[PDB]
Amino acid sequence: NLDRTDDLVYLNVMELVRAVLELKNELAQLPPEGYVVVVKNVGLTLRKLIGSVDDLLPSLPSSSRTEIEGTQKLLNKDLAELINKMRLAQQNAVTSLSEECKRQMLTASHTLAVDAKNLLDAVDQAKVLANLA
């Protein structure tokens, strides 16, 4: 089917989605310090992802290029939101509202992982239409 051999966009989407699933399982049992770290890795994998998307762009149909650049900005918003919720989680670590901002962290990072997965499909789609065009 698909050859992922030198496919960094693929690699970084997977690394990111993995990092999100890690947070999802660990958020329950991590002190405030412990999730700061996992979100920081989510940040890093994302900037790697965005990076490898940038290097790939020039080589696609303009239509796709424009759309993908759009989802890049969206991915960053998703990260901005995740960090927001992590801050809430932190200042509410001893309040009855602790549990809810852990739920919103999981939501935020879940929508980020999904948007990354959606981008992989868009990129894969674009690579194919490039072959056709």
From Swiss-Prot:
Residues 1-133 are annotated as: Focal adhesion targeting (FAT). Most abundant in the brain, with highest levels in amygdala and hippocampus. Low levels in kidney (at protein level). Also expressed in spleen and lymphocytes. It is found in: Cytoplasm; Cytoplasm, Perinuclear region; Cell membrane; Cell junction, Focal adhesion. Phosphorylated on tyrosine residues in response to various stimuli that elevate the intracellular calcium concentration; this activation is indirect and may be mediated by production of reactive oxygen species (ROS). Autophosphorylation occurs in trans, i.e. one subunit of the dimeric receptor phosphorylates tyrosine residues on the other subunit. Residues 1-133 are annotated as: Interaction with TGFB1I1. The modification Phosphotyrosine is found at residue 10. It is linked to Aberrant PTK2B/PYK2 expression may play a role in cancer cell proliferation, migration and invasion, in tumor formation and metastasis. Elevated PTK2B/PYK2 expression is seen in gliomas, hepatocellular carcinoma, lung cancer and breast cancer. Promotes bone resorption, and thus PTK2B/PYK2 inhibitors might be used to treat osteoporosis. Homodimer, or homooligomer. Interacts with SIRPA and SH2D3C. Interacts with ARHGAP10. Interacts with DLG4. Interacts with KCNA2. Interacts with NPHP1, ASAP1, ASAP2, ARHGAP26, SKAP2 and TGFB1I1. Forms a signaling complex with EPHA1, LCK and phosphatidylinositol 3-kinase; upon activation by EFNA1. Interacts with GRB2 (via SH2 domain). Interacts with P53/TP53 and MDM2. Interacts with MYLK. Interacts with BCAR1. Interacts with PDPK1. Interacts (hypophosphorylated) with PXN. Interacts with RB1CC1. Non-receptor protein-tyrosine kinase that regulates reorganization of the actin cytoskeleton, cell polarization, cell migration, adhesion, spreading and bone remodeling. Plays a role in the regulation of the humoral immune response, and is required for normal levels of marginal B-cells in the spleen and normal migration of splenic B-cells. Required for normal macrophage polarization and migration towards sites of inflammation. Regulates cytoskeleton rearrangement and cell spreading in T-cells, and contributes to the regulation of T-cell responses. Belongs to the protein kinase superfamily. Tyr protein kinase family. FAK subfamily. This is Protein-tyrosine kinase 2-beta. It comes from Homo sapiens (Human). The gene is PTK2B. The chain holds residues 872 to 1004 of 1009 of the full protein.
